[PDB]
Amino acid sequence: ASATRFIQWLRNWASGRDLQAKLQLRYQEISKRTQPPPKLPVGPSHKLSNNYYCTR
Amino acid sequence: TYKYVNLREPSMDMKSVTDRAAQTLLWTELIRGLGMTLSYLFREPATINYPFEKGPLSPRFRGEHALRRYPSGEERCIACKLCEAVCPAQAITIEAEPRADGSRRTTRYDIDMTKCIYCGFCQEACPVDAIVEGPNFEFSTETHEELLYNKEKLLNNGDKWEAEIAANIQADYLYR
Amino acid sequence: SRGEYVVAKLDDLINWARRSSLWPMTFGLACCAVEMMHMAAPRYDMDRFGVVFRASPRQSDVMIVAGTLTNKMAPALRKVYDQMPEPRYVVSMGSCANGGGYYHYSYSVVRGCDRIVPVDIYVPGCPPTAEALLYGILQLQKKIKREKRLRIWYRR
Amino acid sequence: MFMINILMLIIPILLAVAFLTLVERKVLGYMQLRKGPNVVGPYGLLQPIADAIKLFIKEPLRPATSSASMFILAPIMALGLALTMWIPLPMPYPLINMNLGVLFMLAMSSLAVYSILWSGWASNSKYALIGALRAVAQTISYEVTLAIILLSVLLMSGSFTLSTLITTQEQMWLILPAWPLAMMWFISTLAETNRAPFDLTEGESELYAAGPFALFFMAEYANIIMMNIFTAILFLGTSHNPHMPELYTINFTIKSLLLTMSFLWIRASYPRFRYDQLMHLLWKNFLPLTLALCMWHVSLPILTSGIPPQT
Amino acid sequence: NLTLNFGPHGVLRLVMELSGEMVRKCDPHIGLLHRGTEKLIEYKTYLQALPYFDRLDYVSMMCNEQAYSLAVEKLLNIRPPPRAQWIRVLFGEITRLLNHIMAVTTHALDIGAMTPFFWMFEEREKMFEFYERVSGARMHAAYVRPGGVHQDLPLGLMDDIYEFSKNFSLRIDELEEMLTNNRIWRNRTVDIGIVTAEDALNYGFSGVMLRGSGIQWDLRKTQPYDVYDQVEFDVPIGSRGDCYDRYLCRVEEMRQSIRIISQCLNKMPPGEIKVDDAKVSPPKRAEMKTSMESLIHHFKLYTEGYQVPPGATYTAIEAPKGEFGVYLVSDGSSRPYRCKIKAPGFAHLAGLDKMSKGHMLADVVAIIGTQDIVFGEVDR
Amino acid sequence: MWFEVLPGIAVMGVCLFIPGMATARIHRFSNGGKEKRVAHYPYQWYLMERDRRVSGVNRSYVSKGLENI
Amino acid sequence: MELLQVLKRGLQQVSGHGGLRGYLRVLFRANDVRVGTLVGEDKYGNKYYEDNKQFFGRHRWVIYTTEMNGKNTFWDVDGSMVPPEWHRWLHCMTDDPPTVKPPTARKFIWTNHKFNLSGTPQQYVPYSTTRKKIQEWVPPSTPYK
Ligand SMILES: CCCCCCCCCCCCCCCCCC(=O)OC[C@H](COP(=O)(O)OCCN)OC(=O)CCCCCCCCCCCCCCCCC
Ligand SMILES: CCCCCCCCCCCCO[C@@H]1O[C@H](CO)[C@@H](O[C@H]2O[C@H](CO)[C@@H](O)[C@H](O)[C@H]2O)[C@H](O)[C@H]1O
Ligand SMILES: N=C(N)NC(=N)NCCc1ccc(I)c(Cl)c1
Ligand code: SF4
Ligand code: SF4
Ligand code: SF4
């Protein structure tokens, strides 16, 4: 991302692609390394009735 | 559904034949390959400056083992041997007896770090979060013997790394 | 005296050259070789440390044993070790090479490559991360920095 | 005063070879999205020194050779001849001003194949001998086109003197009238110096040590630089101002540096030829064209009335 | 006829008979990485044996886990929940990218084209991060298990996979610029190692070793698993049966893998990620620490393991290297009685002598590469 | 960044610059401040030998002009 | 031209490291003259920097202390010198440094971090932690045969 305008033009021309749109180095688009806590769902067998194991 | 990767007829008109002759004689496709390596020379490299910079890891990372305590300082391990039973490599060896105060505790807790496959099954099996794989991965040694951990080594690892281990557990335990 | 001082500086010079130009022969036996490749890959670029990507066994200073050493393979590994010109160092990488790892109880597996060759550095893990291996190579450099070959030579 | 001049050629040649190892590694690194040496000295500037010292204090493991004299002879011949190739080069003034300088370089370079052959004999192993013979066959094969291409160019220069190439290109680089020959000349130097995609000695043995290994390497990289200095003179002639010879030396050095970097560029860009395929590139492609262009370059000065002077 | 005791993943010993440049005989000597995996598995519970599969084709770790998990699930008569199935397809296709990058760039590196290895191995490093974020390990995740997967995706992972996928086809394009039209690359691969459709079938080939020769076969289409019948993609097919066509098939399969990944990101459903059956899958830690039933089942699942009803299954998947299967025999206990691992590279390498007929020594490197051989799975 | 390759190139370039620069200045030092005489042919050698005798100090690069007429 | 703007940025790294001596010190110790924001410093002397405009992986770094636990680390730096509280931040296992999110204090946690001690007198030596299992009969100390 720090390339000068000339150097960006030079490498875009040499490769033939708009490299700057799809840089292979990651910057701020990556997700935060601290995330809010999850709250995961429970499965279909989490019931208090009509749930006898011999039926599943 | 399928597609053909290499099923095409070259055009046999004069313009197309002369295009391929120019490619043969003027090396155009080879020059185009030179263009791509030239553009990489002027890209910023992906190298990081280790050991001053480090590769990114996550709280789930499976590294060096440690034995943990409760906030009071009591050991969490109660010698249930679930970890020893599950260990795919038979890397764990445990002996236990009643402690002088009647507590169920280990007298031996060994991990052969050269048998261990760093699979994390022990920390899944543990019912009290006593044995964990910590975040440390920089513990190479000069001798084989240094990698045969006894309980004192593993307790020292816990006291050494507990600050980071607790925070990592705090970040992932809701996924467990 | 100056004679001791000259020896101390020469040891520093030869140690600096040898740890600054560590050419590895990598025995890519199994999965641990993949993490060795990621250490040569752009993110870690071991070449930037003076560690060329792949040297020939006769131009090598360090053997990296990167994977399981089976019984069938053990003679070949020892033959390559014996052909290495000195000084030569061995890095054992991964549980398999360290002590047999997951296959420690197998009928066909050598229980640690240190039964076949002397080992300077043991890198733990299954596999060790590329960064962990790089830590081990840097640890080997520090070991070479501590050598005092010339100091011991002149006290003989 | 002349011995000073000899040393001021030999020592910079060896230093330039040392730091070409650094430059090759760093240029290859950045084309591979990495850095290359940057720890041993600032920007890796001490890396060549560490490598040189390491190699020379390394154990010189030489297996009991079938010929002690030929084991020693091969590196001496290789390095001795490599340095000799530099003494007629006009930069802009040659150390030795030879009337037949171009012919001297052709004759000396043809002797460099003996170091390959002798090192094969001394190895005391039929496998290495067979590898040597394959390398010799590649080298002599591409000597055919280099000589004929060189002859074709000299038909526009008029003499075998290397400094006359400077005069011939006062108005225009010879690469313009002779870019077809420059193309095949350039590829021939790659194959001549066993450079990728013609590095089949390294590839085939994949599929020497310490100082003696270092000496063969030094001779190889001296030849690589010299070949590219020759190419610049042959096709990219720099103008010489007799009152400011250092302007010639600056411009001519830049062209040689760039040509040498293009050797590293090419090594980073392509896969390797099979042995039979680089043999067909010579005998079935370059040689037919070189022969036809040799016929053309004999006729052209005669038919255009552009025959150069002898003196 | 000259004989060489070794010529040119692991370590191979090739005994070759030459006549000038031409290879007359090619006799691979394997077992240099035979570690008795199949025997060790007999001493493990089904869970304990799962990590052995990471270390077979140790470039395709999660695909190997999937094959074993499917086999155990079939014998157990249970099924993983839909979200686990989508995660398993998502990481199977990420794993295909990991394998195909290694397969193509080390194939190129072996014949001198060294640079694409570096470009694409920075993409491998980024996918190693996806592995590490779900499992805590970069390679041997042990993440796909019988009954589902070990843990749910951490928050934010799917966004980063999208960011990686959005840019990846350009990386393939740069790889193709170096190789696809390069005359040197074509000289090394075109009309090399031609295999006919009939010979490929009878020699036990699978995967790209079949499709390169025109056979229209892909287990994801014909015998689909977890949710492959719910995603759209094309099977690349060769026409010449040679190394160059197989190279093109692998490159196109990378593009189709991205196409599948794009669909998995969009159609990822909510729910649990392992079978809601605690006699097979361990309960959540919070339940294990509050409910008596959960603690008993946790204790038993991590000591004895679950019993598997007696029976035998041959289960196979379309792994990145071809058909990967296990013939798994249960005796009713919690440890497998027998586990034969069918590794596609075993049959492929057995066909090296056939494919190397009439070729030169340097072509053997190209043919070994086109087969994509990892001796972790060949030798087991 | 790519420009960190330049220091190695600069050292290489200076190393290749010295040979040509040294020869040029050594020739001027040893030939009275002029270019070293080129004698590829007998005629040129003959004139150079004649210059050596005409110089009076046995130096072909010491020139005598109208002052000797 | 931007060439001038690039050269100016090069010169500001010299003043950003406190003149030429400081610029050269980091060049030879760390092979990197980048200037970042000081996140904090640990009790051992390591300093932690960030620059979020760098690409992920190069956006955090540590300049190691020159002395730790009585060892000269001017040239001999090690990855194991990073204490656990900063280890989490440096490896991007978290977004917030210990200066904003301090770790939880415990009586038993090491107050003094130790780096890798292999190869030194402080190295770990394994041994069996269990007591003798069988007691031998001790014959009487007096004679009676
Ligand atoms: C008016 C009257 C005028 C009369 C004269 C007119 C003449 C002009 C028209 C003729 C043009 C002649 C071109 C001369 C160059 C040589 C051409 C050539 O040989 O190319 C063919 C060769 C092999 O071709 P291939 O694809 O294998 O198939 C042929 C076999 N069936 O393919 C190759 O050689 C490929 C090269 C392999 C090496 C690759 C590495 C080099 C790539 C980078 C090179 C950069 C360019 C070099 C510039 C050097 C500058 C000093
Ligand atoms: C370029 C100029 C550099 C000038 C530097 C001058 C330094 C002079 C001191 C040389 C020190 C060499 O150090 C020594 O090198 C030889 C290389 O064969 C090594 O090897 C030697 O010792 C080992 C046993 O130790 C032997 O098995 C081996 O056959 C022998 O060659 C030594 O292990 C190493 O201690
Ligand atoms: N091919 C590369 N450029 N790297 C590499 N392996 N270089 C070889 C290193 C070397 C050899 C001889 C000498 I003298 C010096 Cl100073 C350095
Ligand atoms: S990580 Fe796996 S192999 Fe290592 S001790 Fe724990 S259960 Fe055993
Ligand atoms: S570490 Fe945990 S699982 Fe292992 S014996 Fe102790 S309490 Fe049981
Ligand atoms: S130690 Fe682990 S990663 Fe390394 S070869 Fe053995 S099983 Fe594979």
CSV table of N, CA, C and O and ligand atoms in Angstrom, one decimal, chain C residues 23 52, chain D residues 14 17-22 24-25 47-49 51-52 55-56 213-214 217-218 221 267, ligand 3:
chain,number,residue,atom,x,y,z
C,23,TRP,N,24.5,-23.5,6.0
C,23,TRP,CA,23.9,-24.1,4.8
C,23,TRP,C,23.3,-25.4,5.2
C,23,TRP,O,24.0,-26.4,5.5
C,52,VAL,N,20.9,-20.7,3.2
C,52,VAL,CA,20.4,-20.9,1.9
C,52,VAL,C,19.3,-22.0,1.8
C,52,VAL,O,19.3,-22.9,2.7
D,14,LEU,N,37.5,-10.1,-8.3
D,14,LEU,CA,37.1,-11.1,-7.3
D,14,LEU,C,36.1,-10.5,-6.3
D,14,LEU,O,35.2,-11.1,-5.8
D,17,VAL,N,32.7,-10.4,-8.0
D,17,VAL,CA,32.1,-11.8,-7.9
D,17,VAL,C,31.5,-12.0,-6.6
D,17,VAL,O,30.4,-12.5,-6.4
D,18,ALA,N,32.2,-11.7,-5.5
D,18,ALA,CA,31.7,-11.9,-4.1
D,18,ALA,C,30.4,-11.3,-3.9
D,18,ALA,O,29.4,-11.9,-3.5
D,19,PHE,N,30.3,-10.0,-4.3
D,19,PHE,CA,29.0,-9.3,-4.1
D,19,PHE,C,28.0,-9.5,-5.1
D,19,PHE,O,26.8,-9.2,-4.9
D,20,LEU,N,28.3,-10.2,-6.2
D,20,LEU,CA,27.3,-10.7,-7.1
D,20,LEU,C,26.5,-11.8,-6.4
D,20,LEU,O,25.3,-12.0,-6.7
D,21,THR,N,27.1,-12.6,-5.6
D,21,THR,CA,26.4,-13.6,-4.8
D,21,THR,C,25.3,-13.0,-3.9
D,21,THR,O,24.2,-13.5,-3.8
D,22,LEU,N,25.7,-11.8,-3.3
D,22,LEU,CA,24.7,-11.1,-2.5
D,22,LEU,C,23.6,-10.5,-3.4
D,22,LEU,O,22.4,-10.7,-3.2
D,24,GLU,N,22.6,-11.5,-6.4
D,24,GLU,CA,21.7,-12.5,-7.0
D,24,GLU,C,20.7,-13.0,-6.0
D,24,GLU,O,19.5,-13.2,-6.3
D,25,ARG,N,21.1,-13.1,-4.7
D,25,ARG,CA,20.2,-13.6,-3.7
D,25,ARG,C,19.1,-12.6,-3.4
D,25,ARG,O,18.0,-13.0,-3.2
D,47,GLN,N,27.3,-10.5,4.1
D,47,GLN,CA,27.0,-11.9,3.8
D,47,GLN,C,28.1,-12.5,2.9
D,47,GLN,O,28.5,-13.6,3.2
D,48,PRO,N,28.6,-11.8,1.8
D,48,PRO,CA,29.6,-12.5,1.0
D,48,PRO,C,30.9,-12.7,1.8
D,48,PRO,O,31.6,-13.7,1.6
D,49,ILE,N,31.2,-11.9,2.8
D,49,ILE,CA,32.4,-12.1,3.6
D,49,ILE,C,32.3,-13.3,4.5
D,49,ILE,O,33.2,-14.1,4.6
D,51,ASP,N,30.3,-15.8,4.0
D,51,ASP,CA,30.3,-17.0,3.2
D,51,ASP,C,31.7,-17.4,2.8
D,51,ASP,O,32.1,-18.6,2.8
D,52,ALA,N,32.5,-16.4,2.4
D,52,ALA,CA,33.9,-16.7,1.9
D,52,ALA,C,34.7,-17.3,3.0
D,52,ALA,O,35.4,-18.3,2.9
D,55,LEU,N,33.6,-20.9,3.9
D,55,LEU,CA,34.0,-21.9,3.0
D,55,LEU,C,35.5,-22.3,3.1
D,55,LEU,O,35.8,-23.5,3.0
D,56,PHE,N,36.3,-21.3,3.4
D,56,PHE,CA,37.7,-21.6,3.4
D,56,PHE,C,38.2,-22.3,4.6
D,56,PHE,O,39.2,-23.0,4.6
D,213,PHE,N,35.7,-25.8,-3.7
D,213,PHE,CA,34.4,-25.5,-4.3
D,213,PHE,C,34.3,-24.0,-4.5
D,213,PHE,O,33.7,-23.6,-5.5
D,214,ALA,N,34.8,-23.2,-3.6
D,214,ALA,CA,34.7,-21.7,-3.7
D,214,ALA,C,35.4,-21.3,-5.0
D,214,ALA,O,34.9,-20.3,-5.6
D,217,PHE,N,33.4,-21.8,-8.1
D,217,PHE,CA,32.3,-20.9,-8.0
D,217,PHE,C,32.8,-19.5,-8.5
D,217,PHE,O,32.1,-18.8,-9.2
D,218,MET,N,33.9,-19.1,-8.0
D,218,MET,CA,34.4,-17.8,-8.3
D,218,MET,C,34.7,-17.7,-9.8
D,218,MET,O,34.3,-16.7,-10.5
D,221,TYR,N,31.4,-17.3,-11.7
D,221,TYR,CA,30.8,-16.0,-11.6
D,221,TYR,C,31.6,-14.9,-12.3
D,221,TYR,O,31.1,-13.9,-12.8
D,267,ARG,N,16.8,-16.4,-14.6
D,267,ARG,CA,16.9,-17.6,-13.7
D,267,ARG,C,15.6,-17.7,-12.8
D,267,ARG,O,15.2,-18.8,-12.4
H,3,LIG,N1,23.9,-18.7,-5.8
H,3,LIG,C1,24.0,-17.8,-4.8
H,3,LIG,N2,24.0,-16.5,-5.3
H,3,LIG,N3,24.1,-18.0,-3.5
H,3,LIG,C2,25.1,-18.9,-3.2
H,3,LIG,N4,24.7,-20.2,-2.9
H,3,LIG,N5,26.2,-18.3,-3.2
H,3,LIG,C3,27.4,-19.1,-2.9
H,3,LIG,C4,28.2,-18.4,-1.8
H,3,LIG,C5,29.6,-17.9,-2.1
H,3,LIG,C6,30.4,-18.8,-2.8
H,3,LIG,C7,31.7,-18.3,-3.1
H,3,LIG,C8,32.2,-17.1,-2.6
H,3,LIG,I1,34.1,-16.4,-2.9
H,3,LIG,C9,31.3,-16.3,-1.8
H,3,LIG,CL1,31.8,-14.8,-1.2
H,3,LIG,C10,30.0,-16.7,-1.6
